Amino acid sequence: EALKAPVVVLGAGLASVSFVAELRQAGYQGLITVVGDEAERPYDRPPLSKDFMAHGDAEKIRLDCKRAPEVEWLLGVTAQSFDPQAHTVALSDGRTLPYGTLVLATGAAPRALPTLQGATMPVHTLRTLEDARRIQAGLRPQSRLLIVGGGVIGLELAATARTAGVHVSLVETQPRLMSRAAPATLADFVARYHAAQGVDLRFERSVTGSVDGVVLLDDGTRIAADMVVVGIGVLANDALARAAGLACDDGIFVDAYGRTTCPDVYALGDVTRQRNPLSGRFERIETWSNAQNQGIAVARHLVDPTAPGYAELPWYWSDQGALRIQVAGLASGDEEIVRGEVSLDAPKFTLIELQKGRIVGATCVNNARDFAPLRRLLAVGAKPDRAALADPATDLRKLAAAV
Numbered sequence: 001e002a003l004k005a006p007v008v009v010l011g012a013g014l015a016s017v018s019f020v021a022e023l024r025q026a027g028y029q030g031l032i033t034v035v036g037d038e039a040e041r042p043y044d045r046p047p048l049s050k051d052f053m054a055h056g057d058a059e060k061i062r063l064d065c066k067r068a069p070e071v072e073w074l075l076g077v078t079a080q081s082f083d084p085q086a087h088t089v090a091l092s093d094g095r096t097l098p099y100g101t102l103v104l105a106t107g108a109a110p111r112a113l114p115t116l117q118g119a120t121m122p123v124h125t126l127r128t129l130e131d132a133r134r135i136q137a138g139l140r141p142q143s144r145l146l147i148v149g150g151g152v153i154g155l156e157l158a159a160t161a162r163t164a165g166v167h168v169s170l171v172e173t174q175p176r177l178m179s180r181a182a183p184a185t186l187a188d189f190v191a192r193y194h195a196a197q198g199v200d201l202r203f204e205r206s207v208t209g210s211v212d213g214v215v216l217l218d219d220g221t222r223i224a225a226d227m228v229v230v231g232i233g234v235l236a237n238d239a240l241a242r243a244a245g246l247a248c249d250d251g252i253f254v255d256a257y258g259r260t261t262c263p264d265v266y267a268l269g270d271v272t273r274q275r276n277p278l279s280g281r282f283e284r285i286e287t288w289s290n291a292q293n294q295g296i297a298v299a300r301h302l303v304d305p306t307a308p309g310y311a312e313l314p315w316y317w318s319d320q321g322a323l324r325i326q327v328a329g330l331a332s333g334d335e336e337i338v339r340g341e342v343s344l345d346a347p348k349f350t351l352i353e354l355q356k357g358r359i360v361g362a363t364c365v366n367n368a369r370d371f372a373p374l375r376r377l378l379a380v381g382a383k384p385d386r387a388a389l390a391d392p393a394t395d396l397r398k399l400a401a402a403v
């Protein structure tokens, strides 16, 4: 009933690929056309601040579109508008696509830093393969890089650059790193780690401008750099939705079925503002797992309306040099349990966040084995013995089973 052919998807990132693969796997055999503005074989973004940045082979980062047969991918073309009454999309190449169902999977773009508008030195953001190539082409040993923003992508780049012999400074307006989505205990540890690897961290500082290759700060000081990479967050690519009259606020509002306020128009991935089931609040979730899992859930329910809505709880990972970080659920509750020592010597530890005895979040550093059982405990809102949670004798995989 809701799934009317033909299907058109705007954007050819992970959310789009995941969605169209699930349509096909679920048994939808009608037309699917995907419009992607980048002239690139669909690819995954996490490598761009990690192994790609370090090794440079794009053929290792392409998405597998095998599970999406009989899809026409229009690469290198921009959707300029859609008409939700006429059920058409206008493309940059002069063509128009009809749709029965339109899916907005247009992701998000890095925020620009207003104070570096009109800079006369290299200032880049890191979102695309083209961006990664441009940054890498300036990543010369003994170069000086300034990163603005202490989010995970900036820190991943910082680690990659330090490994490459680049001098790295980093300016963060907040008193801590990773202020968006990380427990304070983790953020404090991560700052200690980056400082130990030679990153020059500047907290509670903002950029006020730049002159002749030097960046100015609001403490009245200067940082010289060969290159600036801005990583102060992203803004949803929701321009077509806004123009067409959908409800948007730095992100397209969707329910758990991916429905927008416009009939026959859905949205998924980084472009969406959606319910976080742990907080009960709407948020723009900016994670790989959301893009994949939301795409799959929305596709499944389109093909099979008896399927449940999207219900997965949020999580991400970050690879920052020697730290393999995994974070699930909420950054804080009324209680944190620490498993292991938090030490720069062979870092390995787990954090558990509880709210009235209930697990609401978890972090693992170099401890992948414990993250899977903790996510299962989180998912059912488990209330385990806090003594056992702390006790390292406890096997978390066993708790997961017991529940």
Ligand SMILES: Cc1cc2nc3c(=O)[nH]c(=O)nc-3n(C[C@H](O)[C@H](O)[C@H](O)COP(=O)(O)OP(=O)(O)OC[C@H]3O[C@@H](n4cnc5c(N)ncnc54)[C@H](O)[C@@H]3O)c2cc1C
Binding pocket: 010, 011, 012, 013, 014, 015, 016, 035, 036, 037, 038, 044, 045, 046, 047, 048, 049, 077, 078, 079, 080, 105, 106, 107, 108, 126, 127, 128, 153, 237, 240, 268, 269, 270, 271, 286, 287, 288, 289, 291, 315, 316, 317, 318, 319
């Ligand atoms: C460098 C980097 C590292 C990351 N590392 C991690 C990590 O370690 N862990 C993690 O959990 N997440 C990570 N992420 C986040 C994750 O990659 C994103 O959540 C994911 O890419 C979102 O996918 P999406 O399909 O919703 O959006 P996107 O990947 O942004 O895809 C949307 C596509 O639509 C295109 N588009 C926009 N407007 C139009 C239009 N009008 N017409 C046609 N096409 C259009 C965009 O240009 C883009 O190609 C990282 C992201 C980056 C950039």
